[PDB]
Amino acid sequence: MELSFGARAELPRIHPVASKLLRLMQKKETNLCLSADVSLARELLQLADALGPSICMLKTHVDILNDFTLDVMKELITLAKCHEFLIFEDRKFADIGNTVKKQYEGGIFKIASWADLVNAHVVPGSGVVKGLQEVGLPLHRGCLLIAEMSSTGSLATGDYTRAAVRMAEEHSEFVVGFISGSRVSMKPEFLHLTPGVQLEAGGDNLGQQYNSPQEVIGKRGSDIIIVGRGIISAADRLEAAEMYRKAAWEAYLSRLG
Amino acid sequence: MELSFGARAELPRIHPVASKLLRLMQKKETNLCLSADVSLARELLQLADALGPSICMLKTHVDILNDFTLDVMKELITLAKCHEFLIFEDRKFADIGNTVKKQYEGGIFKIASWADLVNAHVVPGSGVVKGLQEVGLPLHRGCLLIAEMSSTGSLATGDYTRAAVRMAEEHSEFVVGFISGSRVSMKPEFLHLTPGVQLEAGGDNLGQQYNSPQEVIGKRGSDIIIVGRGIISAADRLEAAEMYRKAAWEAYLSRLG
Numbered sequence: 001m002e003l004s005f006g007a008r009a010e011l012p013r014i015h016p017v018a019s020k021l022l023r024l025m026q027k028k029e030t031n032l033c034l035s036a037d038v039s040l041a042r043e044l045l046q047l048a049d050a051l052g053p054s055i056c057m058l059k060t061h062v063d064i065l066n067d068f069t070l071d072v073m074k075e076l077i078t079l080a081k082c083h084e085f086l087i088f089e090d091r092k093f094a095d096i097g098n099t100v101k102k103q104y105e106g107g108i109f110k111i112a113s114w115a116d117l118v119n120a121h122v123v124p125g126s127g128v129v130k131g132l133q134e135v136g137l138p139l140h141r142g143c144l145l146i147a148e149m150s151s152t153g154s155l156a157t158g159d160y161t162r163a164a165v166r167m168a169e170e171h172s173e174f175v176v177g178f179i180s181g182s183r184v185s186m187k188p189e190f191l192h193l194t195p196g197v198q199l200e201a202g203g204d205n206l207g208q209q210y211n212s213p214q215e216v217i218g219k220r221g222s223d224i225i226i227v228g229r230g231i232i233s234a235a236d237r238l239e240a241a242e243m244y245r246k247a248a249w250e251a252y253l254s255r256l257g
Numbered sequence: 258m259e260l261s262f263g264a265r266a267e268l269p270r271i272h273p274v275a276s277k278l279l280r281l282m283q284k285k286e287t288n289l290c291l292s293a294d295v296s297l298a299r300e301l302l303q304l305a306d307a308l309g310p311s312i313c314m315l316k317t318h319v320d321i322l323n324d325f326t327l328d329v330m331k332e333l334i335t336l337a338k339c340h341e342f343l344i345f346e347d348r349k350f351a352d353i354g355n356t357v358k359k360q361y362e363g364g365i366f367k368i369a370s371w372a373d374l375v376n377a378h379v380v381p382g383s384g385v386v387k388g389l390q391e392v393g394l395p396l397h398r399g400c401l402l403i404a405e406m407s408s409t410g411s412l413a414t415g416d417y418t419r420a421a422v423r424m425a426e427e428h429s430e431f432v433v434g435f436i437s438g439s440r441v442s443m444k445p446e447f448l449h450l451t452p453g454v455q456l457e458a459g460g461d462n463l464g465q466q467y468n469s470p471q472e473v474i475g476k477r478g479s480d481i482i483i484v485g486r487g488i489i490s491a492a493d494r495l496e497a498a499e500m501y502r503k504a505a506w507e508a509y510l511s512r513l514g
């Protein structure tokens with residue numbers, strides 16, 4: 001039987017970051033993650049403040065910000081605390097353990113100092129998670145493993161996907177779930193987040209493929225939709241965010257019965 | 258038929274960045290890529306200057322440099338031109354095509370502006386290559402696809418590796434080779450660069466595994482060794498680089514005939 005997000009937040013083996021997230025999802029009736037794919041810090045902060053009420057999570061690509069500073073991220077954290085959403089840096093860590101630990105903690109971005117969640121590809125083997133967790137565990141962070149991808153020709157299928165699930169299971173002190181197109185774990189402590197989402201059928205010209213919130217949440221059993229252009233390119237981004245939220249939220253409620 | 262690096266530089270289908278690399282490998286008698294895994298720009302540049310005559314390539318992780326600026330990269334380019342080596346940013350692009358184009362061109366790092374070579378994981382499908390190529394083509398840049406990894410539990414094996422080789426063949430206008438543990442293509446226009454290399458047997462505590470230059474170049478048929486800690490951890494990095502250079506170069510001479 002399916003548990004509500006609020007009940008899942010209380011599960012004995014739940015990660016604190018997953019619990020925080022699940023509680024605010026239930027409080028705000030949102031399972032929408034905004035993909036804030038913009039080049040200017042002011043745009044990032046403007047979207048975060050305006051859409052924050054409607055979202056459970058803000059997904060960043062800090063490496064495309066033409067004017068990144070750590071003060072930008074300080075300010076984003078204030079907004080995250082005010083409007084109640086988590087910050088997920090979509091870094092796709094994909095190197096050996098010794099390297100990713102440095103990429104997570106250090107450099108100019110100091111990602112671990114501000115991102116509640118990061119994600120990682122499983123292709124290097126479990127050392128990618130071991131390296132990240134050496135930085136993330138002390139800082140009370142969580143990680144998502146990329147079990148499937150939305151893009152045309154994705155190799156994250158079959159035995160690769162099963163490997164991602166095993167890796168998460170064996171590293172549950174740090175891994176809180178998956179980037180995937182569908183439910184891949186039967187354990188309710190894990191979150192499923194799905195990108196490649198728009199209301200209308202389509203794709204882009206560089207291999208992105210879309211499915212609807214009803215399909216991904218309702219039929220495929222994912223928890224959270226990740227939506228970028230579907231919202232950001234709309235004339236009215238507030239109304240678009242609300243349309244996606246309502247869609248994902250109702251799909252969840254229906255599945256839950 | 259085994260061709261020298263100088264001959265391979267003249268192959269009909271050779272990419273101009275591969276040709277430039279192969280020419281300087283032959284001229285300088287080096288098939289050593291230094292993995293400059295340091296956190297300080299001064300150490301990076303001092304290594305680049307001192308070891309430049311010994312290396313064909315300097316591999317960077319600019320996202321670990323605590324004091325990155327574009328002015329640091331300008332000085333690195335100056336050293337690369339002076340000593341004759343290529344700059345390879347080991348970014349491991351691994352996102353959908355629309356995202357990686359921005360991560361390559363933009364942000365604070367503006368990687369395409371200074372890196373001769375970058376690499377990409379093949380897990381997203383060929384969109385990853387199509388996105389990078391939109392940026393790299395007019396700038397006369399090249400890309401390496403990660404066909405195999407050196408780390409314990411790597412999923413880059415079997416059909417995954419074969420998919421990487423097919424993707425390289427189909428995008429030979431931009432893809433100039435592979436990150437691999439051995440020769441994965443029989444086409445001599447492709448470069449093979451191999452990380453996980455040390456003179457001594459062993460590994461690290463986070464999944465790295467090492468093989469020797471003689472094994473990797475000599476028996477496994479790779480072209481270039483990528484060496485980080487085996488050089489960086491030495492008291493005298495120049496002497497260490499010279500050790501690796503001579504090992505790798507003589508291994509190469511042996512399979513030539």
Ligand SMILES: N#Cc1cc(=O)[nH]c(=O)n1[C@@H]1O[C@H](COP(=O)(O)O)[C@@H](O)[C@H]1O
Nearest residue numbers: 095099292406407436452453484485486
């Ligand atoms: N290239 C690459 C990459 C992929 C791979 O499969 N194995 C690696 O070690 N690397 C990188 O090569 C370097 C290996 O360094 P070391 O020789 O283990 O100190 C690192 O910068 C690591 O991030």
Ligand SMILES: O=c1ccn([C@@H]2O[C@H](COP(=O)(O)O)[C@@H](O)[C@H]2O)c(=O)[nH]1
Nearest residue numbers: 035149150195196227228229230352356
């Ligand atoms: O498998 C994946 C993994 C990540 N993303 C990311 O999610 C967002 C998709 O945005 P859009 O296609 O909704 O604009 C982008 O930031 C992209 O990098 C995907 O689309 N698919």
